[PDB]
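Co-fold these.
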Amino acid sequence: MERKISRIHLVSEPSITHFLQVSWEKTLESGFVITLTDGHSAWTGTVSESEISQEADDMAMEKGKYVGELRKALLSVYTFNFSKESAYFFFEKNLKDVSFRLGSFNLEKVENPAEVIRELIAYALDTIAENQAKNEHLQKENERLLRDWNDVQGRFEKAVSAKEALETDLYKRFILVLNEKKTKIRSLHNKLLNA
Amino acid sequence: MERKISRIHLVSEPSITHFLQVSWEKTLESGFVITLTDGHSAWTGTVSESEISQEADDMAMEKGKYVGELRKALLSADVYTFNFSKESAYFFFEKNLKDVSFRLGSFNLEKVENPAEVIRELIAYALDTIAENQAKNEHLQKENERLLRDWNDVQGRFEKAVSAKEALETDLYKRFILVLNEKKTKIRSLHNKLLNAAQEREKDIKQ
Amino acid sequence: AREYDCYGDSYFIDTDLNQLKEVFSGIK
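Predicted complex below.
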């Protein structure tokens, strides 16, 4: 089960910052839970796989294309509106010279906000913990690879410089062995001239 | 300007979890602000630098050694306990040693007028932190992928240099073998001609 | 008469890859 917590601004309260928390399993397509909080109260809503695809029909959009717009708008120009009196939440998209309602939810005021706010904060701290650990693991691999690279690069340097010393070093030896054969040939010729 | 947000368990409320937010500038030693929240209310307190120096003296501890205790206890073999009374707003913690525990710290917090503002800012700080981290892990993931390739690249470059050496080595030796063995043909020939001549002289001596 | 030269290469018997490498390495 995954979740995203975004910071948003409501049209009717540009002053205060609100938090939108969206949670789901696998994909938003199979339904999700959305929670709105101002750090004091909290409003929740559940959107079933049934409702989502129902919305994808009323629009005439592929369930895929429609879920795509929600991902861009809810998981973070998008505009958000909320009425604390009706608990009705809706957001719109704003393009060049036009804007249009993109969706809405009837949220319900939560009975124990503190519990919700405490779980949200707890999640954020766990996430900070997990992310800091990964930052360490990847930081060391970055180090291992750095070293491993230098190693091989050294091997390369040494190998190429050896392929460039070969011809010259093997040829001297060849001349040495060869000269010995020649000397033996000379002495034998010499000895055959003896008799 | 730093801060640490930790979760803690109060003895008088083992059921619910609370959060502690400590923030300072440079070091704890110069002073810090502490905030306690349960997700609905928030209590805040301040500890000045002089207050810390004095408390250390009253506890018969070397100052830095005292601040070290505060770090381990407030900024997350060392067992600490925390207590808080909503009725007095008094917050205190003790370090539990073997059969002997002792007051490590005590603060008279004040219930905040704007809990929501405080909670929102805290959550906001956490989300910003989660954000800064992801960016960093992404920057490191790319640097990881770049090195995985840069190694594979030179690794091949290596194998090729080595393979090229072996091909050149055998190539040289092959030419050498031919020339050397041609001379050995001459030597064997001359050698045997000399023996023949030796046996010839021996026949002349025997008859 | 000697069979080998100061480096270990035969004056009489042909050589090959394996044998010459041995002779060369012996030369420093």
